């Protein structure tokens, strides 16, 4: 391949050739199979509003045109409804044929934290232009849970690519023949469509979770230390297979489809556009090569954050909620310790 | 006695005498031992805001300064909206007789904000001695949308001659002979305090109103599935509860309470702590409340926090139950 996504080996090579820089050595687990986690620096800037830097504008200038400074050396609480800009430890000097995009880590979405990566001269968020040299910034606004963050916190990730080696319908339908993309012959390719499972799981019929209010603060570095029942309310199928989505709430829900991303492909979750005005999958993110790897079954369900917009919506089982889009890897991932993806 | 609260027998005599008037004959169960239910008439007025009529002012003068809704079949009243509803009943009280209004406990359970207003009122839920005129209910649903109609009963009125209250001797004396608490009582009437330990295997302490729901029909409100309107609350860890100010709670007192047949009682908010949380929809207790069947019955309480979240703890005093003399025993 001469077009596709950079695997971890390449991301590591980029760091070794100073095309990607950081304030410190990377975390051992910082480079994912087809993306890199980004870490917060030592200062957060509390802002009145989010902004677009614009053409020929450094992010630092707009900042200086506005503003409370928060030190993250130990840990700061970011409150819901509040907007913070954070210089990231990682910076770039990209090859002119290489671009990148950013998405929240999936655990970021489970805590309902709004984030945007910004570049100098930015006209769009979460997009790094081909050949970009400069710093990176994370805009952070917690929506449901107040959070604690510090120097090193990882809320976001960046995927690097040469060109845009997306698969079209035919390529996707053939990969499902060769490998298994959905554990079901055969999927609705359009990429592959994801629908909502509202029938229930287990003996009690658990469908998912709704976020709670006035919780304790969530430490984003120690997320497994927090009891489930004092942040999330479990939701159980009781009547018909359907759920009223209250627009002020956030819901952690699950796809009906068990999905697989083969090791020479990465994926990205996208909103189902025909219905963006009704409800949306929030915090759509990157899927790594090897997701839902064949085990004795193939494929994992996707966990989805769904919110309704403006008006309450009765979401029904089997409703299509997103589209998993596939893209070629440049090479096969080498894995966490460089000794294989498994 | 020559001072105290009118019993049912006296309330019927007011109606006989045209001191209490209505558009229609009263419902068979409209008169209570120590109060009268008030009924909605045929029209509601959708208003921009609540208002006090004030000196020399008729409510209908302020009303016509709206949008008119017909209650003949049923209307839905939305949460956050204010409606003013002319009541079916009106008064021509004697000079020595006053009245006061509280919501019905059922109204309270549904988080329906209500205020009785009169012509020339400088205060809600207070009918001046010798009041002659109409009555109006201000209504605003806070948690559940509701359906109401002509004849719906959301509020009640207690009539009194004078103001025959009790004191710390009388109250402890009365608790001596007749039992005021199945326990001993904190008299300043008796402090009521909150039960947050739980009930049963599961430890159910109460309910929280659910924040998007079907419309509740106030006349037929023992018709629904409980999980459709309420979130059960179960105690876990400490015997305590965080009161989110956006939230409505139905909880229960620790004390089993009893009102002897020659007394009426009224729940009042606990004033020391009212800048922090309040018992909402404090209402009337009829003579005979909690009559031996195990003597005494528990008070169900609606509680909300003011402005800031508050940790409510087991055995917190949440109110005071205030006793008063009947003029005569309920007929």
């Amino acid at each position: 391949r001469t077009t596709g996504i950079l695997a971890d080996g390449a991301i590591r090579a980029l760091f070794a050739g100073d095309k990607l820089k950081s304030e410190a050595d990377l975390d051992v687990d910082q480079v994912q199979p087809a993306s890199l986690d980004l870490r917060l620096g030592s200062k957060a800037y509390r802002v009145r509003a989010s902004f677009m830097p614009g053409p020929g504008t450094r992010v630092i200038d707009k900042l200086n045109r506005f503003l409370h400074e928060v030190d993250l050396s130990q840990g700061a609480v970011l409150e819901t409804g509040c907007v913070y800009i954070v210089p990231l430890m990682e910076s770039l000097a990209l090859p002119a044929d290489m671009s990148a995009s950013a998405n929240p880590k999936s655990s970021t979405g489970r805590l309902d934290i709004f984030t945007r990566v910004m570049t100098d001269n930015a006209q769009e968020f979460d997009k790094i232009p081909a050949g970009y040299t400069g710093p990176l910034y994370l805009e952070i606004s917690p929506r449901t849970f107040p959070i604690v963050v510090r120097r090193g916190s990882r809320l976001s990730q960046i995927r690097f690519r040469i060109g845009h080696a997306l698969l079209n319908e035919s390529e996707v339908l053939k990969l499902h023949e060769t490998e298994t993309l959905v554990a079901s012959e055969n999927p609705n390719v359009t990429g592959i469509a994801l629908s909502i499972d509202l029938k229930g799981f287990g003996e009690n019929g658990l469908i998912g979770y709704r976020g709670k209010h006035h919780t304790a603060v969530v430490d984003v570095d120690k997320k497994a230390q927090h009891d489930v029942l004092d942040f999330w309310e479990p939701l159980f199928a009781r009547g018909r297979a359907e759920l009223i989505l209250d627009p002020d709430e956030f819901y952690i829900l699950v796809s009906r489809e068990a999905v697989h991303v083969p090791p020479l492909y990465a994926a990205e979750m996208t909103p189902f556009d025909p219905l963006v005005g009704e409800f949306r999958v929030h915090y759509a993110g990157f899927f790594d090569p090897g997701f839902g790897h064949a085990q004795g079954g193939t494929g994992s369900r996707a966990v989805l954050e769904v919110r309704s917009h403006e008006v309450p919506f009765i979401l029904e089982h089997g409703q299509i909620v997103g589209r998993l889009v596939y893209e070629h890897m440049l090479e096969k991932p080498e894995g966490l310790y460089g000794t294989g993806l498994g | 006695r020559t001072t105290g609260i009118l019993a049912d027998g006296a309330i019927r005599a007011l109606f006989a005498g045209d001191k209490l008037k209505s558009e229609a004959d009263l419902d068979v169960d409209q008169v209570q031992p120590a109060s009268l239910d008030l009924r909605l008439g045929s029209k509601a007025y959708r208003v921009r805001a609540s208002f006090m009529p004030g000196p020399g002012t008729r409510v209908i003068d302020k009303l016509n300064r709206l949008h008119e809704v017909d209650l003949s079949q049923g209307a839905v009243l939305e949460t956050g909206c204010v409606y003013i509803v002319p009541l079916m009943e009106s008064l021509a009280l004697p000079a020595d007789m006053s009245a006061s209004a509280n919501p019905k406990s059922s109204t309270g359970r549904l988080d329906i904000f209500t205020r009785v207003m009169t012509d020339n009122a400088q205060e809600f839920d207070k009918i001046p001695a010798g009041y002659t005129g109409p009555l109006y209910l201000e209504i605003s649903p806070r948690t559940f949308p509701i359906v109401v109609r002509r004849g719906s009963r959301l509020s009640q009125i207690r009539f009194r001659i004078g103001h025959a209250l009790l004191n710390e001797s009388e109250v402890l004396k009365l608790h001596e002979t007749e039992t005021l608490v199945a326990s001993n009582p904190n008299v300043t009437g008796i402090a009521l305090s909150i039960d947050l330990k739980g009930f049963g295997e599961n430890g159910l302490i109460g309910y929280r109103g659910k924040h998007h729901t079907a419309v509740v029909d106030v006349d037929k409100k023992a018709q629904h599935d409980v999980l459709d309107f309420w979130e059960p609350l179960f105690a876990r860890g400490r015997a305590e509860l965080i009161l989110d100010p956006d939230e409505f709670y139905i909880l229960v007192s620790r004390e089993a309470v009893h009102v002897p047949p020659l007394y009426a009682a009224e729940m009042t908010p606990f004033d020391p702590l009212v800048g922090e949380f309040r018992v909402h929809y404090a209402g009337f207790f009829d003579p005979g409340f909690g009559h031996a069947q195990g003597t005494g019955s528990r008070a169900v309480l609606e509680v909300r926090s003011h402005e800031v979240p508050f940790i409510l703890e087991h055995g917190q005093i949440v109110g005071r139950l205030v006793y008063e003399h009947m003029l005569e025993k309920p007929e």
Partner: peptide, 7 residues
């Protein structure tokens, strides 16, 4: 063994 909702 005690259900949700939890207070």
């Amino acid at each position: 063994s005690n259900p949700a909702c939890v207070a």
